[PDB]
Design a protein around this nucleic acid. Structure first.
Ligand SMILES: *O[C@H]1[C@@H](O)[C@H](n2cnc3c(=O)nc(N)[nH]c32)O[C@@H]1COP(=O)(O)OP(=O)(O)OP(=O)(O)OC
Ligand SMILES: [K+]
Ligand SMILES: [K+]
Ligand SMILES: [Mg+2]
Ligand SMILES: [Mg+2]
Lengths: 55, 128, 188, 36, 149, 111, 34
RNA sequence: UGUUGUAUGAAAGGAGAGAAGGUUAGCACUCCCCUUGACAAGGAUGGAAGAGGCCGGCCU
């Protein structure tokens, strides 16, 4: 295993926030859902953060 | 006499080089003469290693034989000559306890009836 | 490339060359393929038995020794055995008991032993030949292998009645007294 | 066979059978809440 | 000629094994490796393929289907039955496998096995349509007596 | 507990294998490379047992691999401390008097 | 593998001792083994 | 009594080194390696893929 060093700090944060949001998508979506649409929910997460930075 | 260690050389050359030496049925024996064992008292480990291949009727170390310094020469009697051939085929030029190992056939030692059965079995195999 | 094609390539390599050492390598490879049972036929289809028989006629001692070695393992099969006999190579083998090297002589003896046929097909030839006289000296030689071969040869190609006659002939030569050709051993 | 200490290493360097899924029978999604 | 065709086999296999090594996930892509063997009409390949694929995910729903479909296609029936058996073994809540098993037991013609399978299902009694299905089953054949139980 | 062999043995082995280029020594290449791991230990023991300036020749017990791959000096240099201190005081006196008396002291070239 | 082992088991205190965990000697023996 | 038991680098001959205008900076996710004493750092950001459904093809 590689450690988290100064190069890897921000990318690791995004990597972990991404995985945790994905977990909650799976537990949130109702049983026998027709589509997952996980990638689109993560696109909305990115757009929300980008709108936060731009006020 | 015949125990001299011949040397190697297109002819569609193989992976390992071979010295020029034709093997006749008489040349081959079931007595296998091993020279080049380090003189570190491995009498029994060598014999076990060879007994892996076939069954060894008799093994002894012949000290009269002119050898180089700190080096040993041994005799192995096998039970079946095909076992002797495979023992040569695989053991020859194998590093053994820090020494190059040289196995040669020893036809001088075999007696008249042993030659009789050798030749007869060669005829048996060649006919079929 | 192909086994039989490879053997044919060795045949070509042998024929075109003239360097005696590059022929030494060819006769080595051929004599050691002759040990193979399956490669016999492949050799039988390429006239290489007569290649060996011609090669003994060459006067390079090492080459002749190699040819004899090739023969030795090669003769014993019934097809090949009959071809060699028909060629008339037997006196070529007979010439080899006076060959200087030990190995060549041993090979010749083995080939002679192998050419032995049941039902007394070829034994008669040996008695006529002086080879038996040569054998007596060879049997009592210093070489253990030679001694074993000579004794083995006597049982295979000789008879007790024949041996006694042979011994007498050998004894007569030492004696220096001539024996009539007409006189022969009588069955009891 | 005895091994001398000097030599280095010589060679270069299905799960358990699936457990049955023991589940309550799935409830199919309604079109209303599938719109939700 | 033919040698070119075995070369075609081998290079398509090599790139597919790269594709497979890359993720080991992507089940939709897993089916393609199998169907390409199905085209090549050599099944032992696909049996190992689907064995590996069941190893990655048996929870899957298309995979067990597809395997049994290839079995049906190849008209080899005993293994098809046996592995529908193992399917119903490890996914006993999925209705479809049960349907596609008893349908098969019909069109292949062996009455009792379906009976036993139905009895085994009677443990779960998971859905309303399945019972109706078995009612219709029983009225299909001469028997109305079992249908009362 | 074996018996020490004559020095001709190791001398002949080291002599034969020299430069490790002969095709006959193909299987000793793996063992020589494997023995690289212990060569700092051999250097440590060698320099630890260096002869003192008052002795011409020192003979040391040597533990050598049978292929000739590595040689260890198998001893520890134990000294009596007063005797040892006196011997280097003797060297202090001799070296000083020699630097005084030698007109031109030439130092040897390195390497 | 069967159906009967997913239905809710009896829900009441039939047997206080049966649910109770083993005594200290057994857990010490398994602790020493492990 | 042979042969596909493989790889590195070089030479010769070709291809040409991420960014929805140009010039570029990087850090990672998976699996494929190389240098390395590596829980470090480099090897073009090391290289190579990356939406859904049905049977390479078709549809949004
Ligand atoms: O043709 C090759 C080889 O195939 C053949 N040969 C080796 N071992 C043999 C055996 O057991 N029986 C027969 N009939 N032939 C055999 O001989 C030549 C050359 O042999 P090499 O591979 O060079 O081995 P070797 O003969 O032992 O070399 P040498 O210098 O004598 O001693 C190591
Ligand atoms: K990376
Ligand atoms: K870059
Ligand atoms: Mg990097
Ligand atoms: Mg750059």
């Amino acid at each position: 295993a590689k450690t988290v060093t100064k190069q890897r700090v921000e990318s690791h944060f995004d990597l972990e926030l991404r995985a945790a949001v994905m977990h909650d998508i799976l537990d949130m979506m109702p049983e026998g859902i027709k589509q997952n649409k996980a990638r689109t929910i993560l696109q909305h997460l990115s757009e929300a953060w980008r709108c936060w930075k731009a006020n | 006499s015949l125990f001299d260690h011949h040397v190697q050389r297109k002819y569609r050359e193989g992976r390992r080089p071979r010295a020029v030496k034709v093997y006749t049925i008489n040349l081959e024996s079931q007595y296998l003469l091993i020279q080049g064992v380090p003189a570190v008292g491995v009498m029994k480990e060598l014999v076990e290693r060879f007994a892996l291949y076939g069954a060894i009727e008799q093994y002894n170390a012949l000290d009269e034989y002119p050898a180089e310094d700190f080096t040993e020469v041994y005799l192995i009697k096998f039970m079946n000559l095909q076992s002797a051939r495979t023992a040569k085929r695989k053991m020859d030029e194998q590093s053994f306890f820090g020494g190059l190992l040289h196995v040669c056939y020893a036809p001088e030692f075999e007696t008249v009836e042993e030659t009789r059965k050798k030749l007869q079995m060669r005829k048996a195999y060649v006919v079929k | 490339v192909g086994r039989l094609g490879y053997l044919q390539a060795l045949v070509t390599e042998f024929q075109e060359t003239q360097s005696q050492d590059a022929k030494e390598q060819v006769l080595a490879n051929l004599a050691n393929f002759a040990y193979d049972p399956s490669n016999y036929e492949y050799l039988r289809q390429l006239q290489v038995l007569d290649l060996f028989l011609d090669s003994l006629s060459e006067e390079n001692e090492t080459l002749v020794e190699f040819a004899i070695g090739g023969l030795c393992n090669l003769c014993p099969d019934r097809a090949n055995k009959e071809h060699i006999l028909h060629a008339g190579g037997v006196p070529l083998i007979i010439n080899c008991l006076s060959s200087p090297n030990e190995e060549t002589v041993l090979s010749a003896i083995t080939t002679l032993m192998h050419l032995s046929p049941p039902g007394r097909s070829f034994l008669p030839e040996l008695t006529a030949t002086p080879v038996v006289q040569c054998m007596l000296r060879f049997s009592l030689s210093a070489s253990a292998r030679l001694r074993n071969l000579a004794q083995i040869f006597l049982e295979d190609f000789c008879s007790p009645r024949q041996v006694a006659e042979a011994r007498s002939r050998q004894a007569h030569s030492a004696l220096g007294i001539p024996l009539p050709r007409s006189v022969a051993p009588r069955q009891r | 066979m005895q091994k001398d200490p000097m030599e280095p290493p010589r060679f270069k360097i299905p799960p358990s059978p699936p457990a049955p899924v023991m589940h309550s029978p799935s409830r199919k999604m309604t079109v209303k809440e599938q719109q939700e | 000629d033919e040698e070119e065709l075995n070369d075609y086999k081998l290079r398509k296999r090599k790139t597919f094994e790269d594709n497979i090594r890359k993720n080991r996930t992507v089940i939709s892509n897993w089916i393609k490796y199998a169907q390409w063997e199905e085209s090549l009409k050599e099944i032992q390949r696909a049996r190992s393929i689907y064995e590996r694929a069941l190893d990655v995910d048996y929870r899957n729903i298309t995979l067990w289907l597809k395997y049994a479909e290839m079995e049906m296609k190849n008209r080899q029936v005993n293994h098809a039955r046996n592995i529908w058996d193992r399917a119903i073994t490890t996914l006993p809540r999925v209705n479809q496998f049960w349907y596609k098993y008893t349908y098969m037991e019909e069109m292949l013609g062996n009455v009792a096995g379906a009976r036993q399978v139905f009895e085994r299902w009677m443990e779960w009694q998971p859905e309303e349509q399945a019972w109706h299905s078995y009612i219709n089953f029983e009225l299909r054949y001469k028997e109305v007596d079992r249908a009362r139980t | 507990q074996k018996e020490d062999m004559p020095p001709e043995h190791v001398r002949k082995i080291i002599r034969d294998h020299g430069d490790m280029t002969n095709r006959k020594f193909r299987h000793d290449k793996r063992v020589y490379l494997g023995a690289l791991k212990y060569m700092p230990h051999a250097v440590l023991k060698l320099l630890e047992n260096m002869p003192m300036p008052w002795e011409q020749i020192r003979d040391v017990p040597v533990l050598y691999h049978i292929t000739g791959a590595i040689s260890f000096v198998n001893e520890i240099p134990w000294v009596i401390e007063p005797v040892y201190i006196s011997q280097w005081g003797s060297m202090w006196i001799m070296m000083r008097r020699e630097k005084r008396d030698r007109r031109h002291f030439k130092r040897m070239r390195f390497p | 593998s069967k159906y009967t082992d997913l239905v809710p088991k009896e829900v009441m205190n039939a047997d206080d001792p049966d649910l109770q965990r083993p005594d200290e000697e057994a857990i010490k023996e398994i602790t020493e083994k492990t």
